Amino acid sequence: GFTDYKVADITLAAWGRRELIIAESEMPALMGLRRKYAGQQPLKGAKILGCIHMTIQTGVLIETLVALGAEVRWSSCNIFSTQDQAAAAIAAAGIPVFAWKGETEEEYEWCIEQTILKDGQPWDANMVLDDGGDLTEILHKKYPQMLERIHGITEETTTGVHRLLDMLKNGTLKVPAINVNDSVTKSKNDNKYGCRHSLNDAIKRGTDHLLSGKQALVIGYGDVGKGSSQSLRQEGMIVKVAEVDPICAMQACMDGFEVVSPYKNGINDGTEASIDAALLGKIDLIVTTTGNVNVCDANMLKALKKRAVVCNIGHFDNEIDTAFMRKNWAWEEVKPQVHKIHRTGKDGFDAHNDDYLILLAEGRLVNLGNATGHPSRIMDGSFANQVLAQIHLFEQKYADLPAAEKAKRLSVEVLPKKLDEEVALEMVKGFGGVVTQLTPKQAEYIGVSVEGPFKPDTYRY
Amino acid sequence: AGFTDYKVADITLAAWGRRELIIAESEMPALMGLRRKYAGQQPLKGAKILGCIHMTIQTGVLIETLVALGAEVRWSSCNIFSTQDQAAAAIAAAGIPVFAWKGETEEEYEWCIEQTILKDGQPWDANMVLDDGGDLTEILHKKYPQMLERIHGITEETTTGVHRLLDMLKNGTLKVPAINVNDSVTKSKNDNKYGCRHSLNDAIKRGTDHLLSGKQALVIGYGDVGKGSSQSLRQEGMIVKVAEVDPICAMQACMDGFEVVSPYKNGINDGTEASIDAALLGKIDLIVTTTGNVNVCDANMLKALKKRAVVCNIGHFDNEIDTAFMRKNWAWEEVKPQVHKIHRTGKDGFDAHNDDYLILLAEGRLVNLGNATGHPSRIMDGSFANQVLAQIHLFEQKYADLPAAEKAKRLSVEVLPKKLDEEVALEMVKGFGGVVTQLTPKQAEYIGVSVEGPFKPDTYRY
Amino acid sequence: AGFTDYKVADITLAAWGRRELIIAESEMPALMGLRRKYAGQQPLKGAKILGCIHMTIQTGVLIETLVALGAEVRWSSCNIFSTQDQAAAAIAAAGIPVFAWKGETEEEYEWCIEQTILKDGQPWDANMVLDDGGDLTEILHKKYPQMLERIHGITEETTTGVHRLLDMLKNGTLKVPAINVNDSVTKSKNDNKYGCRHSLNDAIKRGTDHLLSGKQALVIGYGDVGKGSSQSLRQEGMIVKVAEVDPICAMQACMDGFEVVSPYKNGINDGTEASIDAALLGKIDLIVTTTGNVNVCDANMLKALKKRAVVCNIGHFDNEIDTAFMRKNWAWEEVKPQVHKIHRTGKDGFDAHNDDYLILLAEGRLVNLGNATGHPSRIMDGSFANQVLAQIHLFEQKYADLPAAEKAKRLSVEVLPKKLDEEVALEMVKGFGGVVTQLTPKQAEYIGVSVEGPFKPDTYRY
Amino acid sequence: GFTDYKVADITLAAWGRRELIIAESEMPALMGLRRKYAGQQPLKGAKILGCIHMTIQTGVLIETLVALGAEVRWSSCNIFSTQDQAAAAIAAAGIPVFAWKGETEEEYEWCIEQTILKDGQPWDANMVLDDGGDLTEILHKKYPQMLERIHGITEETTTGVHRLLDMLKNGTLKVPAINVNDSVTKSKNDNKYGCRHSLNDAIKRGTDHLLSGKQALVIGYGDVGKGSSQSLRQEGMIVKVAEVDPICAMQACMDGFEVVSPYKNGINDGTEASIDAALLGKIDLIVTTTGNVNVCDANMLKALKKRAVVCNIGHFDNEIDTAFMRKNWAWEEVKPQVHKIHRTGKDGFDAHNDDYLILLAEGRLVNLGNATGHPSRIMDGSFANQVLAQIHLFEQKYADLPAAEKAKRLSVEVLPKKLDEEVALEMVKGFGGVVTQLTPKQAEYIGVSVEGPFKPDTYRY
Ligand SMILES: NC(=O)c1ccc[n+]([C@@H]2O[C@H](COP(=O)([O-])OP(=O)(O)OC[C@H]3O[C@@H](n4cnc5c(N)ncnc54)[C@H](O)[C@@H]3O)[C@@H](O)[C@H]2O)c1
Ligand SMILES: NC(=O)c1ccc[n+]([C@@H]2O[C@H](COP(=O)([O-])OP(=O)(O)OC[C@H]3O[C@@H](n4cnc5c(N)ncnc54)[C@H](O)[C@@H]3O)[C@@H](O)[C@H]2O)c1
Ligand SMILES: NC(=O)c1ccc[n+]([C@@H]2O[C@H](COP(=O)([O-])OP(=O)(O)OC[C@H]3O[C@@H](n4cnc5c(N)ncnc54)[C@H](O)[C@@H]3O)[C@@H](O)[C@H]2O)c1
Ligand SMILES: NC(=O)c1ccc[n+]([C@@H]2O[C@H](COP(=O)([O-])OP(=O)(O)OC[C@H]3O[C@@H](n4cnc5c(N)ncnc54)[C@H](O)[C@@H]3O)[C@@H](O)[C@H]2O)c1
Ligand SMILES: NCCc1ccc(S(=O)(=O)F)cc1
Ligand SMILES: NCCc1ccc(S(=O)(=O)F)cc1
């Protein structure tokens, strides 16, 4: 009589299991590790608190971790990102999961606490898998005693890594972490190509708007901005790119984009006078990709072309000043995760008003909120890295080391390039690709082993 | 007035070269901004720079920037086919020693480098080296080691040259420090990739005027050059397949929409004709090597290629293709300079209407420079702004003046700091009319950077 | 509310449908411009239109435009899977007879068309037909021929429908004139191509959430739908191969950068398993049929496809794929609505973990409408502005009231004049914020056109 | 002792022969016609006046006509389009050719005259092959008696067809014509993909400018403007498109381009005030593609960004107001067919002036002027049509008809679709493409023969 879960509808489990079986065939690197390490059971004794979007893809990751011996308790890291049939299949497998699509903020926090607490007391957790740092934060701030037993954190995404490095710099990080984001088979796969697949996917599902011929402004040109700009350009949008980093802006120019600023001469002085109103009045779609705060601000929202679509694909919703819009403008729900924001005022709207914006997923990550996030064959790389990272920190056994050895190992590290390459090779074979083997003379000529690693650690790909 | 200390193809091309320099200067804002920023300070006064890099119009703007900052130079090309003769002539007419022409022999190539090293029959009192590929660096270490005692540093342009510096550093044979100019992002991820995107299809059209759309290409390699090369051909409508030994680069090729294949069955190169994927190579209209490695388009691949396929190399050296095999066994018919039909029917003569030939560009030497003009000015702007900054830095550090114990602590291969890489990029972006946004103080604090940058940790890969 | 003359899935979706209609109106400036232009004149006053076309949000705006101009209508969908239930509910809640829901059986499909034809058990006094594929046209000619005595014209949306009309005209069996709406440039080269570009990869993602980049696709056909479908996949990074019987379309595929292949050895489809290029089909991850032809993805191709390939059809009718063979021999496993795994291990039951299956989308029916929402409003604007102009033209001509000799001269299948095609395009361009330049008198005289257009001869192909 | 020619340098003939031998391997449709018709000699007795760019590809066309039985006398239809090695190879084969790169207007007219006159008297020509209509006009106006002997004209390009249709309208056309341009294997191959290949080719050879990241304005979006826009966009330019035809403008929007006018509201009233100076002041490259007059006018040239490149790929050099620039601005030759135009005045220039434009090929066809025009494998389709059109008209012997039968036969027609498909099939085989054969049931289902034509004549591809 398994009841240790909370999902929208347990009766979706059979559907979710059908999609898990399909997803498994799309995830050869992750399923390869499941088959490789099953005999060793390297996560026997691991008790993992997991906080990451409860999608079908996350389901294959969860069941891999359990297949290698772990126990887990799971929650989503976003109120809109859960696929309810994925959550139901995991719960019907007997795995504690607290997640549904459309949580309130209070339900979101309740779901994390349900993973942390078992029977009203702290679970004897000893591993953390996090995506964005919310679970990491709650443990350090509200359950610090639990971190005495925890061997490490494996952190999925750019924003969570930044938070770990701030903690490390300030002396507040209590356990070591692996930066999963910066494996090449994560950052330069998931963050870029994942958003290429899923950004225009979510815009179409949300609005069914034609994108070809229309004007877009992408704020940011890091890995997510690069993939997002391509998602839109390959549909035929005229894409303009904003950046604060001149190296990233240089890449945008060379990639064929006009680089512009929302602010005259790029100077954001906080006044309406600084807004390039002519530019913003021609933009049909703005997408924020930065991991920064208030990059689509109130004065920008006032100046945007009527009926423009606004969305965010960075981790947190504060990229767009949705607070200003809740305070001043009237919200008309079109359907779940799609709202018309009427700039005519706060108290009610005319149903035929033409002066509105369309906001997707209330400013939360739009690929997961309005579609299904990245596809399985892309998440394969990210999640193979997660598994390898969990194995590595669980085996290092930090929670048991003497203090001097803790000092040497309290760090945020990445996986070695050899492993990054082994993940990539399984991905390539999933496409039917054939990697050539160096001859001994050729390996000697460029100074590498025939087996790799093939590049110095400085190499940027 | 009596300047004779040069050797070029035709000095009367100087006026033409000067017109093209004046145009190129307006395409190179980072480099020309360095010229303006530092001219009064003369930070290279006293520098005596041996330069070895493709004697193009773009290199001319680099040379005159070094001279305008106070340096003296003596120059040669780093490839027998890459000089633009009008550029070398303009530089010579300006009274600057340059020894370079398009279509040098190997003996003339080595003579030209030695003319930069020697002045009036004796070693020039050089104290700086600017190199592209490592040949000048090698000749100095092997043949003129005494000159290195006075040299403060090497600024090395390209991936292959950096590899050779790092081999010397690990072997204990590198005598002076170096800056790896290649690995600035405004070099590696500008020049190596987008430069080849611009100039590869350029050189193939100039050499052959072949339609590329609808035809099959095989690109060997998918590093920065292979990425840019693959894009050069795909954007023309070619059906491009990619080979790689690096699974991470192979993963990128898959995700970028290319089929990843090996010339060898199951990727295993046992040296026999039997290991060749004859069915694959029999379909390929164009093969491009981009690896920096040896014999990646080998004799058995060449025998298996589709009749009338084009063969070329855009890596730094011609040993990527087994051209020696083709010289030894097959008859060469010159179509026009840097374009040869190689007839696979035998060595002693050929039927003029023979159908079983390959077209080789630039005799397997770097094809974008041999058959066209290499990277365009606005891309080389980034590379050469980095070169000027690197020259300034190593010259000001004065390594050659240190005691032996301190030289040992300073001997290293380094990259320029990120802040400079960003400053080059900013001038490039302004040259496109791009407008970079400035962080507010709260935004800078939120992501943990200074408002002025650097904006990324040194681990960032872009 | 008193009004019961409809049948939809759920009338309570009406308000949601109305919200989407108000958005779609802002995406359809040509259609809303016609509403405002002709509202006062009521040119369709007295028209009674039988309509049979995908009951989507876009069709809703079309319906309410005909009504706003004076017409009465009775509506059904031309496909069992293409209805958007909230669009049908909005139309029914506006008082408009509509019989349509997503997921009809075949018997229910036929019944819905008959409910538009009949009002209270007797033929409605229809006088106009709007059709998409020819099913309603066929039912009237076969089963209700008396009704055609009062009907002034048919306006036919799509290529397959027009083919059927032209065969009836040749055979002397077409009883009323038609307008070929499909062959307006703002329909054929807008809807058929760019609509499939937008909506094909859209439906595949919704149905399977598969990564497309780096995978192998085979598009059967390279007409307008095959062009837009091939681009839909290639822009995602698929490696796309194209099959054609028309060498001119195959030439376009080559120049567009696709490899042109046949599923049969040497292109010869003799019906044997030996004729199948099994090596080619064993590498294909996705096959899309775009032909309007029969059995272009046949039993032997289905047998030979790579395990776990996706199979779909974006032509009008589901017989492009041999789904009947799959129904007879293989076990179907529903993943979710309009997504089935087809287990090639046999008919009775399946292993839930079997690896040898295909994924079929929308049971072989038009996949963009079955698994997503079809073309976007801004593209359908062009098709449906043409539909409204075509309805106005044939209604005002009053074919059914003309003397016999006048009928004989007007019994034809025609396209709208090019001047109207241009006026639709102009509104579409303005909807993008584009600005069309006006010729000077001298420039107009020089190319031999009016400043107002038409700008091209009728022979022009764009 | 053959002397009946004039070329730049006859010693270039061996080079030209080498490139002809290579080009033949790139032109399977044209070489296929040599084999299919050699035995029958369909052009035995044809005497063809030919006027078209004397390129390597034209050399293969010429020698195909001769191999099928024709005699010819040849000139180029543009002063800059000749490849001198090609003209030399043709002269050395004993074929009268009068053409070199860099003719004056006087030499251009003289070269056409030498094809018309053999030994000071009109040659007994009975066939005409033209590209642009200059030879056709000269014969109608200056030697009308020779048209009593001529069976027809086969006209290569859109501008030339327009000029023929003016005469058919006015009743002043003396012989029938084949509109070769409007074969699909010409118009939608040569005019579009040909310019795709050769526009960015000529711009690189002429300027070596980076195109990625820069702003282009393409005037026109017919077949040449479509291919031109793609030539630039695929290099990473940000391309804007002007059109007067709203259908063509619709296609540009859908193809992912911003459609703009050089003039406010699109109204070309001839004033400086009409110019959108903000737009023109951002454009790095303008390309005219219209076949119309003065579509890049004096006020657009005055407003263009400093150092922008200006070129024309339409047939005639009056698309750009070069006359205005010759009268008012100082011209500095960079190298052959590349000039800087200094907007500081006419009385000389400062060698370091920054306020100049770069004009390519003096406003003449830039792909042939600064590069080599379309590649062999594209020109294969166009020229296979030219050969079939010459046979199609020669075998009909219009000049032998009585006046009443001539009237009935007098027309400007395209080749039937069956020939168009025959050319396309040979093109497809040259790529190694495999066309599928319809089954009888399938052919019956769509109402075509298994042997084609597969499309009604109304079809637009
Ligand atoms: N939705 C998804 O599936 C998904 C996937 C991966 C990562 N992410 C999230 O997306 C965000 C970005 O990730 P990334 O890996 O691209 O990071 P990144 O560091 O590579 O890129 C962020 C970029 O934003 C730029 N930027 C910062 N402030 C800006 C401003 N005011 N205006 C313009 N540009 C500005 C920076 O210069 C930087 O290049 C993070 O929150 C990350 O966690 C989301
Ligand atoms: N022509 C130019 O203008 C130009 C510009 C920049 C660099 N280069 C030269 O091009 C070469 C490549 O430079 P890069 O920056 O791209 O280096 P890189 O290290 O980024 O890429 C080289 C790639 O070749 C691959 N490779 C090695 N052996 C291989 C084999 N046998 N088969 C397939 N792939 C193989 C490696 O895995 C690697 O990814 C160097 O010689 C460099 O100096 C030329
Ligand atoms: N789903 C949609 O939204 C949508 C939109 C428009 C049209 N359609 C339908 O799509 C179909 C195609 O329409 P179209 O306008 O592209 O027609 P089309 O005539 O332009 O093209 C169909 C192509 O199929 C090719 N073909 C025929 N049999 C073939 C075979 N056995 N193998 C390979 N190629 C073959 C033909 O040569 C032709 O070029 C029609 O049924 C039409 O009604 C669907
Ligand atoms: N250089 C080459 O190799 C080459 C090849 C083929 C044709 N051409 C020539 O190029 C020209 C164009 O040929 P095409 O086949 O594209 O003809 P086209 O009729 O298909 O296109 C010309 C286009 O220009 C547009 N146009 C006319 N006046 C305009 C104006 N003032 N502003 C903007 N747009 C305007 C028209 O609407 C039309 O769409 C003709 O002179 C033709 O002979 C050149
Ligand atoms: N006007 C800015 C002057 C300037 C010009 C160039 C640079 S650099 O990036 O190429 F070192 C830096 C500063
Ligand atoms: N210009 C607004 C009036 C108008 C609105 C629509 C059209 S139509 O081409 O779409 F029938 C024509 C004219």
Side-chain angles (χ1 to χ4, degrees), chain C residues 227-243:
Chain C
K227 283 173 176 79
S229 301
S230 300
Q231 176 62 21
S232 192
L233 308 179
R234 186 250 298 278
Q235 76 195 27
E236 291 274 333
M238 295 205 83
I239 293 84
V240 174
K241 289 166 181 66
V242 176

Side-chain angles (χ1 to χ4, degrees), chain A residues 53 131 157-160 181 186-188 190-192 194-195 198 219-225 242-245 248 289-295 312-316 319 365-368 373-374, chain B residues 437-439 443 447 455-456 460:
Chain A
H53 311 295
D131 184 337
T157 204
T158 328
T159 288
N181 185 76
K186 201 292 181 167
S187 52
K188 311 313 181 167
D190 171 317
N191 301 31
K192 181 156 62 183
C195 291
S198 60
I219 309 296
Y221 204 72
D223 288 326
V224 173
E243 250 295 353
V244 300
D245 180 328
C248 295
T289 73
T290 67
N292 206 345
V293 62
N294 219 28
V295 307
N312 165 49
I313 194 160
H315 189 82
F316 283 129
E319 304 218 15
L365 330 75
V366 66
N367 60 326
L368 284 143
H374 299 350
Chain B
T437 298
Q438 284 178 7
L439 291 157
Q443 285 175 329
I447 66 175
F455 300 102
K456 299 288 189 302
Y460 193 69

Side-chain angles (χ1 to χ4, degrees), chain C residues 29-38 381 385-386 388-389 419-428 430:
Chain C
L31 198 47
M32 300 302 290
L34 280 170
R35 263 194 222 187
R36 292 187 313 262
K37 182 184 178 167
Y38 285 102
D381 188 33
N386 282 279
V388 170
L389 292 166
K419 186 77 179 80
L420 291 183
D421 208 355
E422 299 179 340
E423 290 175 12
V424 171
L426 181 58
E427 295 315 304
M428 295 176 74
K430 284 175 180 180

Side-chain angles (χ1 to χ4, degrees), chain B residues 7 81 115 188 191 209 230 253 363 377 396 402:
Chain B
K7 184 70 170 184
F81 295 144
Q115 299 313 300
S188 52
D191 169 323
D209 292 295
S230 295
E363 302 190 42
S377 296
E396 289 179 343
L402 293 169

Side-chain angles (χ1 to χ4, degrees), chain C residues 273-333:
Chain C
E273 276 207 275
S275 66
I276 299 299
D277 189 342
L280 169 75
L281 294 185
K283 289 177 36 171
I284 296 293
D285 299 295
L286 168 71
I287 182 164
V288 188
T289 57
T290 76
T291 66
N293 208 346
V294 59
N295 206 24
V296 311
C297 185
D298 62 26
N300 289 326
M301 291 169 56
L302 289 167
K303 288 172 78 171
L305 275 171
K306 188 176 175 184
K307 285 173 193 189
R308 298 183 293 284
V310 172
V311 174
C312 64
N313 167 51
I314 196 166
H316 187 77
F317 284 124
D318 66 296
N319 58 352
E320 300 213 25
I321 302 159
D322 195 349
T323 62
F325 163 83
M326 299 202 283
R327 297 193 181 283
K328 158 105 82 181
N329 295 288
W330 289 340
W332 294 38
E333 173 185 20

Side-chain angles (χ1 to χ4, degrees), chain C residues 32-51:
Chain C
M32 300 302 290
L34 280 170
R35 263 194 222 187
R36 292 187 313 262
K37 182 184 178 167
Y38 285 102
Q41 301 160 55
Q42 292 296 280
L44 295 177
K45 172 49 54 211
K48 286 176 197 289
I49 307 173
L50 296 167

Side-chain angles (χ1 to χ4, degrees), chain B residues 201 205 209-213 235-237, chain C residues 255-256, chain D residues 53 131 156-159 181 185-205 211 218-235 237 239 257 285 287-291 311-316 319 364-379 382:
Chain B
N201 68 43
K205 294 185 182 166
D209 292 295
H210 273 2
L211 176 65
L212 306 178
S213 315
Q235 74 193 29
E236 293 270 337
Chain C
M255 293 295 180
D256 286 347
Chain D
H53 316 288
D131 184 341
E156 175 81 353
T157 201
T158 329
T159 292
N181 184 81
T185 50
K186 200 299 185 171
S187 51
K188 300 224 186 179
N189 159 50
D190 171 321
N191 303 25
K192 177 155 59 177
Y193 304 119
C195 295
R196 179 193 179 181
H197 173 102
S198 58
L199 175 59
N200 66 48
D201 188 16
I203 294 167
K204 287 180 186 172
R205 298 189 200 203
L211 303 183
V218 179
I219 310 296
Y221 205 74
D223 289 331
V224 170
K226 282 178 182 63
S228 291
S229 296
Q230 178 61 24
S231 199
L232 303 184
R233 186 245 300 276
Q234 72 195 29
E235 291 271 333
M237 301 200 83
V239 177
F257 300 109
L285 167 65
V287 184
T288 61
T289 69
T290 64
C311 59
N312 167 52
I313 194 164
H315 184 73
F316 281 124
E319 305 219 19
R364 276 74 168 168
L365 291 167
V366 60
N367 58 326
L368 289 144
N370 287 86
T372 67
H374 302 347
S376 296
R377 196 165 290 273
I378 284 179
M379 289 318 294
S382 308

Side-chain angles (χ1 to χ4, degrees), chain C residues 152-453:
Chain C
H152 305 299
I154 295 159
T155 62
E156 166 61 50
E157 177 82 359
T158 204
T159 326
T160 289
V162 171
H163 172 63
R164 302 169 70 179
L165 289 168
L166 290 176
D167 283 340
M168 295 171 62
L169 184 65
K170 180 181 283 298
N171 294 331
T173 59
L174 174 62
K175 290 293 111 171
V176 303
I179 287 182
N180 171 359
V181 173
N182 182 82
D183 280 341
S184 287
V185 186
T186 52
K187 199 285 175 169
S188 54
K189 307 191 69 151
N190 157 45
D191 172 319
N192 299 31
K193 181 160 60 176
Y194 304 122
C196 292
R197 183 199 179 176
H198 177 104
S199 58
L200 172 57
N201 69 44
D202 189 13
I204 293 160
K205 288 180 189 175
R206 299 190 201 204
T208 70
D209 291 295
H210 277 359
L211 178 66
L212 304 178
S213 316
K215 298 185 174 157
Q216 297 269 322
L218 180 50
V219 175
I220 310 298
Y222 206 74
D224 287 329
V225 172
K227 283 173 176 79
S229 301
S230 300
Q231 176 62 21
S232 192
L233 308 179
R234 186 250 298 278
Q235 76 195 27
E236 291 274 333
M238 295 205 83
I239 293 84
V240 174
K241 289 166 181 66
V242 176
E244 254 289 352
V245 300
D246 182 322
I248 293 175
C249 297
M251 173 277 300
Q252 289 176 302
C254 294
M255 293 295 180
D256 286 347
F258 300 111
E259 193 175 348
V260 170
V261 304
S262 184
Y264 314 92
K265 300 176 190 173
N266 300 319
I268 298 306
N269 181 358
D270 66 1
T272 60
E273 276 207 275
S275 66
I276 299 299
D277 189 342
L280 169 75
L281 294 185
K283 289 177 36 171
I284 296 293
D285 299 295
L286 168 71
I287 182 164
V288 188
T289 57
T290 76
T291 66
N293 208 346
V294 59
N295 206 24
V296 311
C297 185
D298 62 26
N300 289 326
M301 291 169 56
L302 289 167
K303 288 172 78 171
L305 275 171
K306 188 176 175 184
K307 285 173 193 189
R308 298 183 293 284
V310 172
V311 174
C312 64
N313 167 51
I314 196 166
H316 187 77
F317 284 124
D318 66 296
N319 58 352
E320 300 213 25
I321 302 159
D322 195 349
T323 62
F325 163 83
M326 299 202 283
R327 297 193 181 283
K328 158 105 82 181
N329 295 288
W330 289 340
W332 294 38
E333 173 185 20
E334 176 172 327
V335 179
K336 59 177 181 175
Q338 287 77 59
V339 182
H340 295 85
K341 293 166 65 203
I342 300 186
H343 296 265
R344 302 188 292 191
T345 47
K347 182 62 180 78
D348 297 88
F350 57 92
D351 194 318
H353 294 96
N354 171 49
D355 67 323
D356 186 7
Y357 60 88
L358 303 170
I359 296 180
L360 177 71
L361 297 180
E363 306 192 32
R365 277 72 172 173
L366 309 113
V367 61
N368 58 330
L369 288 144
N371 286 93
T373 68
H375 300 349
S377 295
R378 189 167 296 274
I379 281 182
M380 294 310 302
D381 188 33
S383 305
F384 287 170
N386 282 279
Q387 276 287 2
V388 170
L389 292 166
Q391 283 284 319
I392 290 171
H393 174 259
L394 287 178
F395 183 63
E396 291 182 343
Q397 170 178 256
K398 293 295 193 296
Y399 176 89
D401 303 324
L402 301 176
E406 267 302 323
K407 284 187 157 83
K409 294 200 285 209
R410 302 183 190 262
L411 179 54
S412 71
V413 178
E414 310 276 5
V415 295
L416 293 175
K418 178 179 297 308
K419 186 77 179 80
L420 291 183
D421 208 355
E422 299 179 340
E423 290 175 12
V424 171
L426 181 58
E427 295 315 304
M428 295 176 74
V429 170
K430 284 175 180 180
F432 292 101
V435 177
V436 173
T437 293
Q438 175 189 79
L439 293 159
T440 66
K442 292 306 105 189
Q443 285 173 337
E445 173 183 345
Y446 188 75
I447 67 179
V449 306
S450 172
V451 170
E452 299 283 73

